[PDB]
Design a protein around this motif. Structure first.
Motif, PDB file in Angstrom:
ATOM      1  N   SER A 238       8.839   5.389   5.289  1.00 15.67           N
ATOM      2  CA  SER A 238       8.806   6.564   4.422  1.00 15.67           C
ATOM      3  C   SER A 238       8.148   7.763   5.109  1.00 15.67           C
ATOM      4  O   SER A 238       7.528   7.619   6.165  1.00 15.67           O
TER       5      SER A 238
ATOM      6  N   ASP B 270       5.546   9.485   4.331  1.00 13.74           N
ATOM      7  CA  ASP B 270       4.076   9.485   4.357  1.00 13.74           C
ATOM      8  C   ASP B 270       3.452   8.283   5.077  1.00 13.74           C
ATOM      9  O   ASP B 270       2.353   7.833   4.728  1.00 13.74           O
TER      10      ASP B 270
ATOM     11  N   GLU C 213       4.494   4.999   5.460  1.00 14.53           N
ATOM     12  CA  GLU C 213       4.497   3.684   4.820  1.00 14.53           C
ATOM     13  C   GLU C 213       5.776   2.890   5.096  1.00 14.53           C
ATOM     14  O   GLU C 213       6.856   3.461   5.255  1.00 14.53           O
TER      15      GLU C 213
ATOM     16  N   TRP D 288       8.329   0.459   3.514  1.00 13.97           N
ATOM     17  CA  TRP D 288       8.836  -0.058   2.252  1.00 13.97           C
ATOM     18  C   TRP D 288       9.916  -1.089   2.533  1.00 13.97           C
ATOM     19  O   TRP D 288      10.707  -0.929   3.463  1.00 13.97           O
TER      20      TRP D 288
ATOM     21  N   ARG E 242       5.533  -2.806  -0.065  1.00 17.57           N
ATOM     22  CA  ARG E 242       5.005  -1.598   0.546  1.00 17.57           C
ATOM     23  C   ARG E 242       3.769  -1.906   1.390  1.00 17.57           C
ATOM     24  O   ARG E 242       2.792  -2.461   0.890  1.00 17.57           O
TER      25      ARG E 242
ATOM     26  N   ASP F 248       5.180   6.123  -5.354  1.00 22.17           N
ATOM     27  CA  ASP F 248       3.969   5.561  -4.738  1.00 22.17           C
ATOM     28  C   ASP F 248       3.035   4.893  -5.753  1.00 22.17           C
ATOM     29  O   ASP F 248       2.618   3.752  -5.562  1.00 22.17           O
TER      30      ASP F 248
HETATM   31 MG   LIG Z   1       4.679   6.540  -0.123  1.00 23.25          MG
END
Ligand SMILES: [Mg+2]
Ligand SMILES: CCN(CC)CCS(=O)(=O)[C@@H]1CCN2C(=O)c3coc(n3)CC(=O)C[C@@H](O)/C=C(C)/C=C/CNC(=O)/C=C/[C@H](C)[C@H](C(C)C)OC(=O)[C@@H]12
Ligand SMILES: CCN(CC)CCS(=O)(=O)[C@@H]1CCN2C(=O)c3coc(n3)CC(=O)C[C@H](O)/C=C(C)/C=C/CNC(=O)/C=C/[C@@H](C)[C@H](C(C)C)OC(=O)[C@@H]12
Ligand SMILES: [Mg+2]
Ligand SMILES: [Mg+2]
Ligand SMILES: [Mg+2]
Lengths: 7, 293, 293, 7
Positions: free
Chosen positions: B64, B66, B68, B70, B81, B126
């Motif tokens: 993702s 930011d 992360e 997933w 996540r 999130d």
């Molecule tokens: Mg996120």
């Protein structure tokens, strides 16, 4: 053989 | 031309399936047998992320915006996540046995995913609220999911022989593939802004524009059985040929080149591109990289 | 408190993105789809400035000290200029396609701009000489650019997680934002003389002094995705919340208030202040104004 | 959606 049958 | 090197994993249990790279050359793989996610550091070291409960069947994954990772849990009815701090969060889906599979980021940052048994596109934030959108047709078996140039999410419908389009307001739109019962699988955004996809049965590379115009190109190897497709440099489109044990490349003039992997029966699955190296996961316990030179 | 009025454009093709006001209440917008620049006269009439060639992707703009509208052409590798006689001049950049974005006036009158793919700060004079300064780090992806109280130009480095400083002599200096991979975008000079900025990923309003001291303030709405920031009255700092569909305001005590737009999915972009009205551009075919009541 | 991906 690609995970879900038959992907 | 190109060159093919296969990295052998040390965990031999594991089943490498979905692959992705990051804002360095960090490659992340899902391992559906080991029930874990591993990362191979730019230069050397693996770091595995063992899931809390067994039998989750980790399929697709994506990095993702930011920072992360997933991923979907096909048999656990969950969305997973890994945060930047290395901890694993899991989110159970509203309906029992939805069977999440494909996963990609939405234009606002939300994470969208497909539910195969569930027959609906998903959506997660999130802080972990989920909303779903039922498909029109019974048993479409939605699979891969990608973000198109028109900022709607594009998905293949394995049983329904279609490429689906879903925008932000859950408005769903379907385009029937000319090749009857072709069973589409991989879908990706091409650098020409059209959506490119594979036909496991039809044995074709498919192109659909945002407008909806479809063109098809036949894979030279019969019964190639293509699984995943990714965009490379320029107009290049690379794809893993699971049944033929090869890596296909749709190059200039829409010509398909096929590079033999040929360590036998390797089962190529997920595929991506870091800018120089085509990375692809092979279910038979190894990771393939392919550079031009 | 305040009040929110959205004027709808008559051109529907258009995509209003960058906004600025003049030495009257003349508001100028860039329209990247229409490939033109429009101006809304103090009371009533629009005047479009259609670019000679299609596909330029007009991004940021600013009104120079000598009554000219300067703008960047993101896809045409050009710097544009409307003279006070209404004619359009275009200046091609030395390096192919450099992808100019942000733009602001320098202390001597020169027009400075950022090149995203180019990875360098630019510099242009009325008679149209250009000189550039390469950034130290690979792929900093420089974006907005503003003129600080120390008469150096300050810019955000979206990929390099930094606020950059460039003086007249091309001396470049970088300050790493505490929030990892925050992806800063909008930067502006605040009335306290510090440089204020947004973090599209971190979800924070950032403040950097000329000395380099950084302080951060969290945006109440999760995943707000802020784009542009402008200084209002007193210590006010207004910002467009693209992902949350809101207008954010950093007021007394560094408190953030958030005003909803509530035309759905409007895509607020550029933002400015004429002394009484906060003007902001919404990519979805309208322009928002916000006054205190 | 903010012009350059993803500003
Ligand atoms: Mg996120
Ligand atoms: C909250 C989520 N956000 C924002 C945070 C994202 C949704 S969005 O911003 O990505 C979106 C994508 C494109 N939309 C357009 O208007 C658009 C896309 O291409 C174009 N316009 C280009 C044009 O030239 C315009 C013209 O073709 C117009 C078309 C094709 C209009 C189609 C109909 N548009 C809509 O009805 C909008 C539908 C949804 C709500 C879209 C999207 C989100 C996908 O509207 C938009 O907000 C935006
Ligand atoms: C394209 C695919 N084709 C057709 C062209 C080939 C047949 S296959 O590949 O699908 C086959 C099914 C399962 N195989 C596994 O490796 C496997 C199944 O479960 C497991 N691995 C899980 C385990 O790790 C452990 C398990 O208890 C026992 C194992 C793994 C035994 C592995 C030893 N297998 C072999 O010696 C051979 C493996 C390949 C050759 C096999 C064939 C022998 C059938 O096929 C596989 O690729 C595949
Ligand atoms: Mg298999
Ligand atoms: Mg001038
Ligand atoms: Mg947009």
């Amino acid at each position: 053989x690609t995970x879900p049958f038959x992907x | 031309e190109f060159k093919l090197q296969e990295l052998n994993l040390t965990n031999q249990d594991t089943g490498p399936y979905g692959i992705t790279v990051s804002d360095k050359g960090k490659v992340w793989i899902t391992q559906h047998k080991a029930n874990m996610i591993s990362c191979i550091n730019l230069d050397g070291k693996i770091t595995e992320y063992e899931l809390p409960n067994k039998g989750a069947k980790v399929m697709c994954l994506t990095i993702s915006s930011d920072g992360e990772v997933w991923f979907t849990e096909n048999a656990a009815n969950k969305i997973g996540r890994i945060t930047k701090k290395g901890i694993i969060k899991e989110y159970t889906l509203p309906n029992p046995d939805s069977a999440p599979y494909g996963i990609t980021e939405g234009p606002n940052g939300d994470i969208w995913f497909t539910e195969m048994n569930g027959n609906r596109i998903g959506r997660i934030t999130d802080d972990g609220k989920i909303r779903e959108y039922e498909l029109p047709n019974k048993g479409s078996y939605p699979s891969f999911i990608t973000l198109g140039s028109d900022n709607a999410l594009w998905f293949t419908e394995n049983q329904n022989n279609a490429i689906g389009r879903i925008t932000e307001s859950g408005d769903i739109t379907e385009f029937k593939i000319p090749t009857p019962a072709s069973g589409p699988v991989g879908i990706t955004k091409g650098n020409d802004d059209a959506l490119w996809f594979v036909e496991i049965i039809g044995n074709k590379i498919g192109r659909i524009t945002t407008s909806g115009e479809i063109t098809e190109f036949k894979i030279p190897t019969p019964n190639a059985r293509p699984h995943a497709i990714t965009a490379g440099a320029g107009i290049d489109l690379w794809f893993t040929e699971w049944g033929a044990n090869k890596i296909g490349r749709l190059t200039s003039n829409n010509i398909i080149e096929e590079y033999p992997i040929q360590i036998k029966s390797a089962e190529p699955a997920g595929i991506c591109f870091d800018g120089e190296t085509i990375w692809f996961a092979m279910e038979c316990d190894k990771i393939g990289k392919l550079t031009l030179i």
